[PDB]
Amino acid sequence: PTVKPPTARKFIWTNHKFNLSGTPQQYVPYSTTRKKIQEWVPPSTPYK
Amino acid sequence: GVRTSPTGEKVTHTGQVYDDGDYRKVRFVGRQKEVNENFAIDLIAEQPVSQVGSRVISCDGGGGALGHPRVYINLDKETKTGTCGYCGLQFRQQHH
Amino acid sequence: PSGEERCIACKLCEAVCPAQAITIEAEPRADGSRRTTRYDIDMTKCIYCGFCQEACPVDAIVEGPNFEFSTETHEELLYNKEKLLNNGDKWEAEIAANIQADYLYR
Amino acid sequence: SNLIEVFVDGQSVMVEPGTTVLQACEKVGMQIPRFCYHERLSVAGNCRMCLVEIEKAPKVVAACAMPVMKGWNILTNSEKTKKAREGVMEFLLANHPLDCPICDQGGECDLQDQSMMFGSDRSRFLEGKRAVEDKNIGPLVKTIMTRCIQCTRCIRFASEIAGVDDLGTTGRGNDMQVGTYIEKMFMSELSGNIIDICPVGALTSKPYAFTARPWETRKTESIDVMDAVGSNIVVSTRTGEVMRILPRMHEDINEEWISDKTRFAYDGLKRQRLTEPMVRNEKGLLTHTTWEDALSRVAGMLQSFQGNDVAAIAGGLVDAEALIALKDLLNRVDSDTLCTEEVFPTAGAGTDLRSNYLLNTTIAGVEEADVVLLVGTNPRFEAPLFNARIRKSWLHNDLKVALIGSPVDLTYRYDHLGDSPKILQDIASGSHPFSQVLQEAKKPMVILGSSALQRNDGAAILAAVSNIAQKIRTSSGVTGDWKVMNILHRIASQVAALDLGYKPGVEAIQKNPPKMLFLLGADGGCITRQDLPKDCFIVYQGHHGDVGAPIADVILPGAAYTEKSATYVNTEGRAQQTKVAVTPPGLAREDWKIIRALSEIAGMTLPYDTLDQVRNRLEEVSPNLVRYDDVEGANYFQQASELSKLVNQQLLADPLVPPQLTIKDFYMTDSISRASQTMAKCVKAVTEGAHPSIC
Amino acid sequence: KLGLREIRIHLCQRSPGSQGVRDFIEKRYVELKKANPDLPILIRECSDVQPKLWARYAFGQEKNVSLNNFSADQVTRALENVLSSKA
Amino acid sequence: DTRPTVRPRNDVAHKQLSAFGEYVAEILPKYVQQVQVSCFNELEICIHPDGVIPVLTFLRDHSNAQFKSLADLTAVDIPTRQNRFEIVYNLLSLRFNSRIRVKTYTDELTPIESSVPVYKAANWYEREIWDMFGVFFANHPDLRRILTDYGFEGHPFRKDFPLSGYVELRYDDEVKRVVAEPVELAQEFRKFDLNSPWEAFPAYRQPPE
């Protein structure tokens, strides 16, 4: 890289991070989607 | 950009965030929730609209074979910009 | 280069994956673009065969040069779209150079 | 016979004169390539993709428009035929855009498949392509006209099937563009079908945009319940989620079309859903509970009441399995007050004879009729796929159609006799000149919509219209085996309920106010707490909380038509069963099992434990309910006419006015459609107008 | 109450074994409906079904009487055994 | 034959194998039901299952056949047929440098005669067929499961057998043992419908209906 530097882009990490497994900064998977079925909320007014 | 729901959990670029009563938040206790902070929708909006002096312009995404399939964009409509369906770049016709 | 995602949720990688390691869901984005709301690769189903990057029409999904990412739990290898984008933002300086040196053989 | 002999690659085949070269190849299992030809539209012959060599002829012929001459040897696989398909496919793809990854038609595209089956494998096109500007034609159909191949299937369909001359070709040459020219919305009850008949991704579904790909979907063959036509559909699902609804070909019901509500109202299945049982807490509010707790409360009340104190109202989407189970449960407490929201006259034979409330001519029988009379109905919106059948006969058979009611645009020109029901009396006597048209008619057809029977004079109107059908079927001039009288229903669960013995309408409940009411999917507002004893016990079983849930004391979640194997009888007496596409959302359960569970807790266990056993019960009550896809003829019209004349009701002076005058009244008629965000956009689009699509 | 609540008649439109019930309906049903205005008399016709006469009494009790090959007069007598006994 | 992308056609071999196909049929009319040669010059002899030993013995021992090597023995499950299974023998002739295919059939309940007396190689191949298809071979030295687990129920390679089976294994700590329980999948296998609705090969079209 001292002779042929990499192309610079503004989204590329400026700080490299090593393997973070087993530490508080580890990767925890989860679903990136939103809830598909919306439930019905009963009215607050007591009726009657 | 990255928002935060009232509980303090960062909202991803897909709009995902666990509700207050969701037990699945427990998976982040003692760990972190991995959220990418470079929202594509925000970055693509920062790009300027290019002015082109023709009815039809073509975009391959930049780089030739390193881009995306070459599509052609119509600029006749004067009330909006023409948008590439692959990369999101916008084009306009010079003074129509 | 603009920072926009290359993936347009075509699902060709999902269809060609020999191990069915890829899961994709998509919808119209707030600006109308065709983008995925889910991109999961089960790195324990994947056979690291390269078909997904051969099938991608826009070079969105690639197999990088990193081979040191051992984990202490089975859950850390179930990548979602957030993990995969961070890998791209992490190894882009190297991935873009490797593609440059090989795209004329593909 | 008159059959002529032609050869398809040397194989003899006998075809009727007028048959086309394309149709002759179907007789031997060969399918000619096509983009413009559709078997249900006019022959265009402008894509030139069906060119086929004829032996001893130097010129290729358009197989879709060329009648077969005697002794022709059609060569479907010669070098000339294959070189004609490569050239045409090469010209189609010259200006086509490289949009396959971002195009919703990818994977189920005729241009892709016929390019890989009949075209070349590369391009010699070294120019710039054409780019066309997109057009807005409503909130349902997304247009990307750079992908259009100028096949004109949408133009022919809109003009012929839908009777709307809004689409056309502007300009000429390579710059020929399909559209409305002006900013206009192609909002029609059959507008969604232009998505299917478009071979390319130029026309696509907007709600379905980008969500799925064809290969990853699972197809469940089911039945549409948004109306009483019983349109056959395919429910596409992926990973336990409903993605889209598609037509399923059925020649005798819906061809290969479906109305917009059927196609786009599915997204209301994902909103305002009842997922957990609820009971009223000590504060008077609905609170989540368990099936054990919820059913114990209902069983406790059911056991303490009997006779004319337990009554039920059946909704518009209930299935036969739930209707029979609820009737059996209530009959075990000596209750016969089983009611439906839809009214139907009970005077005379009432529901004793099926022919008194069926479409006795059958939907497919409209094509052999020569005169059709409509009474107080807007079939365009009540039964959109039964109005399309009328237009097909009006277009191909020169059918004469007359209407007694409000002058609503039916997409075809009819004869307006007026609006007052008193005209029905003139026709039955001879004063009206139209009475002569019915006597001369060889196969007349009289249709009375069930929306006209909602008036207080329904008994008189039914008697008056049935009187006309009696002075035309007995008097010599009509073939013996032709039915004349017809009723056009609009509710999917009506005919099944009347077959089982339910009392039509909520009249029985208003004269014997019960102390325990079952609202089985009843969201029409026919009965409210202002018409019941104070502190009445109301149990609502259903899948949406729209109008009955907020007033109920116990809410028992149920399954929608896409989540159960259930039997529905369409307006012509045809029994059809849905198939499970996805399971109910949360704690929701199959409707007939909730009643079966309730009976066991209350000590009156019903004698069936499985779906096959419940359908055996249906065979006992009405055997036709288990003859799927079969129409059982109903007879004894003479008996109904006699019993109808015993009591002479008078017709109200008020004119007949259908509840749905304009298309803005068509997008919302039930719980599912009123919970849909696409139907809400359609209503906003047809009132406020259209005041960003790229891929 | 032990009274009758419903009568259901099943028959085929063409089978020779259902001719008696059809003869009953063509001539006698109109009279039997006028004498029992408030009694539901369901007449459900299918194809290739053995004729039967169902009678639902109070509290869900149902009894059926086979009408196969019956004449037009036995069918009339069968109903009278149902509308009169009220068991 | 100069076309670079099209496989060259060898018509000399096609002729020789057709002649030997008739030769076999003429000598064994009692069992031979059908003979065919594919466009890639492969010969198939279709026989009645009662002729497994006579037909194989002739091909192994006859001077002009000398098929002394059993390359493979396998079964194919076609549920649409009354005899859903199709036992396939691939034989190799070192003397004449040629290959032949012998095909027969059987259903779930009909035994097939063992080929061990002719080819010792068939000993393990027939265990695999029984193991993975449930076809019983009569007079086998020791017929056992060879590939599945001990006590495995079902024959996996049947078309009606699910891909993921009916049981799965895990270690249970309560009983200090590896236990078997009904199958549950965290992600269900996604079924793709890939067939194009447009005919690909007219040459293989079937008569209508």
Next chain:
Amino acid sequence: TRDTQLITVDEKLDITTITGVPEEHIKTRKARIFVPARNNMQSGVNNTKKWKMEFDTRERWENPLMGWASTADPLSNLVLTFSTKEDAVAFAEKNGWSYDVEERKVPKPKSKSYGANFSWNKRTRVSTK
């Protein structure tokens, strides 16, 4: 004739006890025998030429970890292809499954004339081409 010394067995073929399938998946199931309907998005008819046997759809839920679609139904992806309806019915009864048969739906022949597009006195005249 054969010399295998055949025997006479007169009883309906039944292999439920030797297929190894569990009891709960032979008696509670329901196999649908049908000819697949045309995908309305296309015109090809090559997918509507063989009978298929698919079973009833069971519950799919959401994996708590990644949100995937989980199942407990081993026969959720089981599709069999048959040349004829009688072949499909025979296989279903042999394995003890309960089956519902949907009779094939064939498009009816239609009279298509290009000359009717330009008619002197009929409504089939087209206003556009």
Next chain:
Amino acid sequence: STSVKPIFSRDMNEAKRRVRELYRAWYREVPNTVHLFQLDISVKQGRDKVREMFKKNAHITDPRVVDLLVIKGKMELEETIKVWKQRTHVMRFFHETEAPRPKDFLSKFYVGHDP
């Protein structure tokens, strides 16, 4: 139509001779299986499991189907005698780690959608 090659038996009388013979072989082998494998069950439990497995297939009337059941059952006995099976395989007949599924309609109704 009804002529078919037999496996071992020509009629049910011949097939039931093999079934009883197999039951004797299994009946005498349970005491050794409980011994060699060190199973924590008793001989009575094991011999009642053998009886249960035989009773499941008591409704068969086809001599060819019965022969397969005896052939399959004989293979199971061979593995047990020769200790090709392990303690895990022998104890898989008892389903000790599966919670008892409900049988009545109400219990199945509460917990899910399956019949």
